[PDB]
């Protein structure tokens, strides 16, 4: 089910402090090796008047490379497919739910999201893009209750020096039994390679595998 | 602003993946604090979380201010304000809402979104088992230049204890008008009739402005 | 009885702000079924304090509180032998302090043995660099889990320039022997220093409560 | 000097509760490994899950790569200090402070800790804690201070894990060369206890990275 090369495609609707927008997004990435690419294309309420840098994230850790020690929660799900539901806490108050349905088409996975976002202050890195890139992460991922959750307070470089935290709580649901792993990591590294002025255009990209920490 | 006025709203939102949709109808007594209100569900029935949720969601322009207390709401008409809210549950699920609330002659127009994750499959949201919301006192200040209502309140649960939020609430209106002091707003909300899912519900609202201890 | 119309306190609170310790002692008047109570507290080491006076203040009982009684008094009912409370108070800056307090009772007189720590407080924040002014009068709301009452608000300081500055309660009481539960109820207060020094070395503490049970 | 010694007074309370503890171990700061044996001495049986101590118990022990600014191996022979507020899920909440002090080879903390709000059914109150899992904090420059952060979970007894977030402040009392974004590898075992875990025997391995990177 899981070829080397595989083929994405998205659409996002959603609304941040009450400003709806549409962004509809195509890419590849390769599943094994934990990277993956993509180009999203504002298509309702633009300008976009806030940081894009709160979308990357929602806009697949199935391109996580994991080793053979890990037992992989993701690609056990396919054809099938999972979703992931997820809030992301910032430090200033404002907070970002998400939601995302994973299926499957051949070689082409097709995303299905919803992110809202409210209480974000007029004069906070967000609303005012003083956000330059998401700092490199560490993901953990932990099983409660039968479903596995991930968990981490990462940050924001903001323009001129400092970071802007953000605390994410990710609940993954897989649509078919699979087995379930135990606590270990994944490492993140997310940025954007390339822009427009009004962020219309956006290239982002990302590169993710699997650790199990410092070992005992 | 007159004495006697009507609600009309449309929640569209969505719950751990599920969207829905609610349509809702009412009568309320700005001066006086009180409301009413009928809701049908008319999209992802039957709703499969606890209703008890989205009732704080479904104006504080029904709350008795006293003259003493500058009335941030009422104010706001015949152009308007609009509120945005995250709630945040103990137990890890947090609800996003935003509703923009215009005026049409008499009649309050209400357009809300609703969005809630990451709330556990055994916990009250998902099996229902939440009684009502409890008496609160929101606690509403002005912070860089918009007001802000915070609240940690609970629910009380079927079996017994209680379920808590924490609410934060920024209402900004449409128009520049006097920003109030530090002040609360009390609350009473109860569902008092129901149609078994649900489906059909009865929501009643009590709510007075103070400033608590002398 | 056992309770009269009016009680002594005597008190001793040890603690610690960002590392640096200090102790004071206090003593006061109170008249537990009218809600009122007055002090005299006296900063007896580590003197002068870096940090704002009013971050002790909400440390310095609920017998204090004019209770009908159509609402159960939880804490009255536990005298001669008294009750235990623990705080956790956490500012929306990232100052948190934690606070313990053992009450007893010898005749008329409360003794409180008080232990108080605040960690992670900024030094540009308002509470090391003294810009708080006074207490805003909250609303408290108390609620029964696990056989003990807890104490929850949301409540805030106001600063010098303007605006407030928040902070989050989460408190415990625990009574020595066993008493009746109330039901979930609140009660509203406002606390303020009606004398000081320069240094806040002397503090005059005032404190006014009555419990009741929301909107009719 | 690269071998380093330990002796450490933690005074504290938990739920009201007070204790004591003290303790003396090895270390090598350049490689991130150290090794303790502490005894409680005051307040003795713990009525709480010894594993949230163990944590309390200064990164210089980090092996630190040279593209990455050492901010603690910087701040010595003065020392630096640093607060904790480590909040776990169900509401217990504890706040910490070590203030570290060289006297030549040999590490001198003064620790104190209070926990608050730690219900009676739980893990930590019942001492149904197993151990920590390694973990991945992240540490910042903020106001000129460094900062580190951490979501990290305690292995439980039955099965499944019980968050907790920690917030450290680390500020030296001497001027200092701050670093960039970065990041920590933790690992903290105890080996050995007693019954009433009166005597315990720690160990931590901790190594700084930069994220995600035949030669």
């Given at each position: 089910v899981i070829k080397p090369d595989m083929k994405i495609k998205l659409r996002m609707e959603g609304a941040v402090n009450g400003?709806?927008?549409?962004?509809?997004?195509?890419?590849?990435?390769?599943?094994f090796?934990?990277?993956?690419?993509?180009?999203?294309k504002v298509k309702e309420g633009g300008?976009?008047?806030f940081?894009?840098?709160?979308?990357?994230?929602?806009?697949?850790?199935?391109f996580a490379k994991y080793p053979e020690n890990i037992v992989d929660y993701f690609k056990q799900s396919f054809p099938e497919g999972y979703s992931w539901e997820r809030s992301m806490n910032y430090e200033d108050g404002?907070?970002?739910?998400?939601?995302?349905?994973?299926?499957?088409?051949?070689?082409?996975?097709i995303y299905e999201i919803r992110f809202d976002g409210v209480n974000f202050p007029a004069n906070g890195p967000?609303?005012?893009k003083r956000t330059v890139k998401w700092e490199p992460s560490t993901e953990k991922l932990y099983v409660r209750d039968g479903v596995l959750k991930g968990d981490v307070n990462t940050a924001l470089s903001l323009e001129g020096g400092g970071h802007y935290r953000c605390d994410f709580k990710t609940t993954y649901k897989a649509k078919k039994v699979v087995q379930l792993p135990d606590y270990h990591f994944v490492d993140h590294h997310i940025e954007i390679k390339s822009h427009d002025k009004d962020y219309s255009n956006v290239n982002l990209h990302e590169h993710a595998e699997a650790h199990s920490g410092l070992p005992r």
């Open positions: 400003h709806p927008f549409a962004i509809e997004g195509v890419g590849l990435g390769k599943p090796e934990g990277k993956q690419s993509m180009d999203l300008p976009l008047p940081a894009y840098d709160i979308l990357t994230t929602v806009f697949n850790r199935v404002g907070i970002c739910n998400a939601t995302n349905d994973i299926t499957l088409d051949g070689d082409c996975y967000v609303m005012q």
